[PDB]
Write a protein that holds these residues in place. Structure first.
Motif, mmCIF file in Angstrom:
data_model
loop_
_atom_site.group_PDB
_atom_site.id
_atom_site.type_symbol
_atom_site.label_atom_id
_atom_site.label_comp_id
_atom_site.label_asym_id
_atom_site.label_seq_id
_atom_site.Cartn_x
_atom_site.Cartn_y
_atom_site.Cartn_z
ATOM 1 N N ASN B 273 0.846 -1.212 0.000
ATOM 2 C CA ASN B 273 0.000 0.000 0.000
ATOM 3 C C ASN B 273 0.867 1.241 0.000
ATOM 4 O O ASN B 273 0.895 1.988 0.985
ATOM 5 N N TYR C 155 -3.132 8.871 5.380
ATOM 6 C CA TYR C 155 -4.206 7.935 5.768
ATOM 7 C C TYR C 155 -5.517 8.177 5.039
ATOM 8 O O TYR C 155 -6.428 7.336 5.083
ATOM 9 N N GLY C 156 -5.631 9.342 4.402
ATOM 10 C CA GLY C 156 -6.859 9.692 3.711
ATOM 11 C C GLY C 156 -7.380 11.033 4.167
ATOM 12 O O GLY C 156 -6.617 11.853 4.669
ATOM 13 N N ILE C 175 -13.212 9.520 8.788
ATOM 14 C CA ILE C 175 -12.458 9.358 7.518
ATOM 15 C C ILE C 175 -13.452 9.112 6.376
ATOM 16 O O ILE C 175 -14.162 8.110 6.394
ATOM 17 N N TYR C 177 -12.672 9.217 2.868
ATOM 18 C CA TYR C 177 -12.040 8.849 1.604
ATOM 19 C C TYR C 177 -10.590 8.442 1.837
ATOM 20 O O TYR C 177 -9.864 9.060 2.647
ATOM 21 N N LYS C 178 -10.175 7.388 1.141
ATOM 22 C CA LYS C 178 -8.852 6.816 1.342
ATOM 23 C C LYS C 178 -7.894 7.131 0.185
ATOM 24 O O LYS C 178 -6.690 6.894 0.304
ATOM 25 N N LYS C 183 -1.634 7.416 -4.105
ATOM 26 C CA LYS C 183 -1.325 7.812 -2.732
ATOM 27 C C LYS C 183 -0.871 9.299 -2.589
ATOM 28 O O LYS C 183 -1.073 10.121 -3.507
ATOM 29 N N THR C 185 -2.413 11.228 -0.737
ATOM 30 C CA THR C 185 -3.729 11.843 -0.812
ATOM 31 C C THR C 185 -3.848 13.066 0.113
ATOM 32 O O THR C 185 -3.791 12.958 1.360
#
Ligand SMILES: [Ca+2]
Ligand SMILES: [Ca+2]
Ligand SMILES: [Ca+2]
Lengths: 534, 534, 534
Positions: B273, C155-156, C175, C177-178, C183, C185
């Motif tokens: 990830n 982490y989002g 949270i 949205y991820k 990434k 984000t």
């Protein structure tokens, strides 16, 4: 009169001193430089001259691909039973948790003769030394390497009998000595004098923390008692002494019943207005050889004038023998023998690399691999042996690509050097240029400002003026009027103390080379090589 | 039928594909691993088997002392005039401003035959390739290296006629192509197809930015026009593709009048990830070989399915021929021919290093230098060819010093490896221990908690379980019950992408070795070697 | 007339665009530069002028001691209920496993007015943004930081209601949205348009991998579906585009019913004949602001003309309004208000640091800390806003120690700058000297070749000529005849892409400073400051 240290200047470490009747020899380590093992001679310990390099054939010494500061570490020269015995080490791995190496023995009736095919010994450590006891037996001592990562690598001194009759080491090997708390215990030599075996070792490592210590035992196997006043020799505690890194010593008993101790030193460039304990110095002349007078107190050897080592030492009671210089200040390449002060990297020169025959009065170098190669460089060089000198040459070369270059070079190892070259550029044709490598950082500082060479110039003259902390190159097209090239180099950058890596054990050289990447082996003709100290 | 890429798995870069009637061969680079140049064979392009290593004697290939990822770079294999021609490169310098290397030509009637004494070519760059034109002329192309520090090193592609009659390059060499703005222009191949000479080059470097481009000219000399759709092949823009680093290709016209393209790839371990553009992947299997189908549009070749390259590809119209496996999952060393999937470092194995004859049913390794030596390691190894496998062996060894060790090793280069060893400790005698090196940082993580080996144990079984991102060793004294050793290693650390230095061109191996630093050549007997992919 | 990107040139990242009736504003981040948050204004989106810096007092913004590229990260400017709302972030830790920061809210009825005392929000991540929904509720969105060393830190996106009545965040944070597999984000903005809430996020990190993606939901709370065609915006895949690093966007809906997207870009220096995928570029003007057109397809927004972003973009249907220049090319310091284009580091200037009143027609800087201090420098500076320009000044200063210096500086951060200084030397008196810092490597390249200043020179003229890849200083004692000082600097070394460390988020400045280490606060009087682009 007086010995004036150092007696062996420039790159000349790990002196192994040896008496043969009334002749005295010192063997020093040569690492990647060929041919191997410098042997200097003296009658009086005051005056010395370079006379031999025993390891001069691939069958004795094969160092193609050897790392920098691998190859010939500390040599051991002894004389016994009417012949010379040379113990040498070929180091293949110079860094990390191991120090893979191989020790060998060769012999010869004279130091300048043809030495015998080598006898294979062991490889449990470097600094192998051969001891000839007065009962006819012989023993090898060497340091024993411990690779374990959580241990100091210097496990102590290993001893094993050597049999000349069987041409091998025999019996069991034994650790006989573990050294002092200074550690880096290496350079073992045993001397059987009166009622004791004396074990001499270097300690502290070959830096400013270098020392020599002596221990003694009634039997060869030990146990050895360490000198209460250890170390015997060191200037670690005296940062102002002219001689630094004093250690890796060997002892001689002259025919006049006097005692001298050869050892290596470093002589730093002036450190300037800087903290004397922090900046111990940079040594472009590498590790040199000095010699001290020894006196005996309570059956322990002691360095006359103090353990720091002195520059001006009482000479032995022997009538002086001075020597002629072993090279001409201007070498005109009129002999078919390359001067003994020239060495090449790693391998024997062949007529395909360098020829004095192809063209009378010239050294012809046929281009080979670059200054970065540990294989085949068409490159010969001699030691910086003073902090101030001029070296020069003139070269005829017709390059037709940037892949071809020939010139004058100041060199430490494959990633530390500078050079002024005759080479070629697409827009300007033949040009003079500057290349350098500073601990593997490469630069060509002139960039586009290379200096065009007129088509009618046959020999380009190239010069370096070394002036203590800096040096600079110049050129001339007529050999009379010189132009400086605007790139000033620091001499400290070609020193043991500056260079990176596990192996930092040689010193600065200056020489001449020819590179031809294309594989066409383009020849460069050098008309002469000058080296003049001021 | 489908070609399932990669067709040659584990370390197998720079594929040079070649047709001889209905036989297909691919040669791949081997760098420091000996014997040199892998040759695989196929009838159908789907199923491949390893059949030869032509460079199997010192007169052909001498890499003693060669740096990691020096030696054999991309090879070139062709068939013409009823024999095979192999162009190869021995690289001596792998980093810095030069890439000193030498190109050679050898020939043979069969790929598994005895190849002829090498013909000396040039050294102006690597990636040399021999083009046989339809008029009976032959030409060498290679990359031309520019050392100048303010220039990109990849100056373009050089062309020179080669004369088989004179056994040398003849006439003048000319730069024929300078490449695109992607640069790193290398791997030149010329194909004369219809009205054009096509020049294929690899560009971008053999990382994630790798590509292949095509240029074409009505004459061999140029000028070459570049494909307006360049590159032909690359997955740089697609970080999700199964095949990465797609480049260094060669083109084959099959006997069925179809067109296929061999090229190298890397297959990253799972990135997890983590940002997909940033962390492109670690490839412990090194660079492997794949093949794409080629179609022609407006007289330009194009990769079928997209330039990123497809992991499964429609096979040519040739009936399937499958091959027997080339090794036994459990090799019991009952034959005196060391299996073709084992190689050793740099030099030919001799009976003084390794023997299948000394003791039947055993491989005896006589201890040589450490795992950090570029000289002589008594060490044989085979490629990791899957992300998930077990390998194991069992060894009889009687070490009496910590300078002796024998065992099972995962190895990338001299400064990147790990091993489980049978060795010796002063207090516990024979013990099991772990050693590793991570970009030259050495560790022995068990410290004092080494595993004692009972005196009555003849063969100690050792095993590595490789499980995609991690691997771990264990040992057994009975061959049935195993104990894990608590050191868990990261597979990514034995990958092209992780290892430091200019040469990062091989791949992870697994093998068995015997170290004896003493010089005693102590034998270790290995009863078997197992390798099984899950 | 086309929108000519970038619309905001030089250091101007993280554009938050905001419409207030028929006025358009863009807020950009300022990091350590004070006063904080630039606001530019436009009527037509084509022509912009700098009009305000809200964060101009310590109670709003206290950055004393802040790290380089700490302080004001991306700001968020909105207009609702007849007033402006500014969310801002004060970052205190720029590297390592945490990014300790604090978010605040302030308001004002006009961008250039006196902003309200800040409301404390949260600290769970940077990039906070205030969304005003059409039902009167308000929400803060920001990124949520995960410090765990084995996880990506991003982490989002977290959502929490903000209450204007209670002056605080209320309810639970969630949270929502991820992000995608790209990434990094960050940069969340929510827009409620028709039936959807659109969440825009920056991804990939603010380098060449930068992008923007869009996701949508029927509820503010999610779940958000990601655009099949993501990203919305990026040039990662096109290394040749003039605009690079395209991401961190905000969306505006004009009063003319058109849609535009402000976003940051980098514009690299020419990379020359170097691999285009490997050397993506150096950006001395930092991250600048551009604007694209948006169109709607299937209720997804799309960048008109391709995801990569265009340089020349069609303007909206709004009559042109051009602005006066906001500075004089030659600033004679005759006003008592310092020009809006000047900023200082970290803290408000006071009369004790800088004064325009002390001596009319001069800026008087009273010496403070060195160029390496994160506390108090008497240093004011303005952005490089072109690759080619001259900046100059003249200064009257009487240093009597090398601890005093005043001059002209090109500056990125405390460890990346250069300067030409009027200062003092023991043997030569007042002299001109050059100092620079290259990623914490300091040098004074003139050494002894400093330039003596005649006792009778009152104002020393100092200049820098920035010429794309290099720049160089000159001086003049008569203000007519200038001489170059022989030290050429590389503009690439004052770029986001060159400077080391976790915070690389500003850009090159040029300004004037006065250092007095003694504590005597020696004044330097500057008669003018000239900035001329060409
Ligand atoms: Ca001559
Ligand atoms: Ca067996
Ligand atoms: Ca004025």
């Amino acid at each position: 009169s007086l010995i004036k240290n150092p007696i062996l200047r420039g790159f000349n470490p790990d002196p192994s001193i040896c008496r043969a009747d009334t002749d005295y020899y010192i063997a020093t380590s040569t690492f990647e430089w060929f041919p191997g093992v410098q042997i200097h001679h003296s009658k009086d310990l005051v005056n010395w001259h370079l006379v031999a390099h025993p390891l001069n054939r691939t069958s004795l010494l094969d160092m193609k691909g050897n790392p920098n500061s691998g190859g010939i570490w500390a040599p051991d020269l002894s004389y016994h039973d009417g012949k010379f015995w040379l113990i040498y080490t070929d180091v293949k791995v110079t860094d990390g948790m191991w120090k893979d190496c191989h020790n060998y023995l060769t012999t010869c009736e004279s130091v300048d003769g043809v030495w015998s095919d080598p006898i294979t010994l062991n490889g449990s450590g470097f600094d192998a030394s051969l001891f000839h006891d007065n009962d006819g037996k012989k023993y090898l001592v060497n340091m024993y390497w411990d690779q374990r990562t959580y241990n100091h690598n210097f496990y102590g001194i290993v001893l094993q009998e050597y049999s000349d009759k069987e041409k091998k080491l025999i019996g069991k090997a034994k650790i006989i000595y573990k050294g002092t708390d200074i550690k880096y215990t290496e350079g073992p030599h045993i001397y059987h004098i009166g009622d004791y075996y004396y074990l001499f070792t270097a300690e502290g490592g070959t830096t400013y923390e270098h020392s020599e210590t002596v221990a003694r035992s009634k039997n060869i196997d030990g146990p050895y008692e360490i000198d209460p006043e250890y170390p015997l020799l060191t200037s670690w505690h005296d940062p102002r002494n002219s001689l630094q890194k004093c250690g890796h010593a060997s002892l001689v008993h002259t025919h006049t019943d006097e005692w001298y101790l050869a050892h290596l030193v470093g002589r730093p460039l002036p450190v300037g207005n800087q903290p004397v304990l922090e900046q111990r110095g940079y040594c472009p002349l590498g590790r040199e050889t000095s010699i001290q007078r020894i006196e005996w107190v309570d059956n322990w050897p002691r360095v006359v004038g103090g353990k720091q080592g002195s520059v001006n030492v009482e000479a032995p009671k022997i009538p002086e023998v001075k020597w002629e210089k072993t090279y001409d200040e201007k070498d005109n390449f009129d002999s078919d023998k390359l001067n003994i002060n020239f060495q090449s990297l790693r391998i024997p020169l062949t007529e395909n690399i360098a020829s004095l025959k192809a063209k009378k009065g010239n050294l012809r170098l046929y281009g080979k691999e670059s200054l970065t190669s540990t294989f085949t460089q068409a490159f010969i060089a001699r030691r910086w042996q003073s902090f101030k000198f001029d070296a020069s040459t003139s070269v005829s070369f017709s390059p037709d690509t940037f892949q071809q270059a020939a010139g004058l070079t100041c060199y430490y190892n494959t990633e530390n050097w500078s050079t002024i070259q005759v080479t070629w550029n697409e827009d300007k044709g033949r040009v003079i240029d500057i290349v350098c490598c500073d601990n593997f950082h490469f630069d060509m500082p002139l960039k586009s400002n290379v200096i065009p060479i007129p088509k009618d110039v046959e020999y380009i003259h190239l010069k370096v003026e070394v002036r203590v902390e800096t040096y600079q190159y110049s050129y001339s097209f007529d050999g009379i009027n010189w132009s400086k090239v605007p790139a000033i180099f620091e001499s400290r950058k070609l020193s043991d103390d500056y260079v990176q890596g596990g192996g930092f054990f040689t010193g600065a050289f200056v020489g001449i080379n020819c590179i031809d990447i294309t594989g066409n082996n383009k020849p460069a003709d050098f008309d002469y090589f000058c080296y003049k100290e001021e």
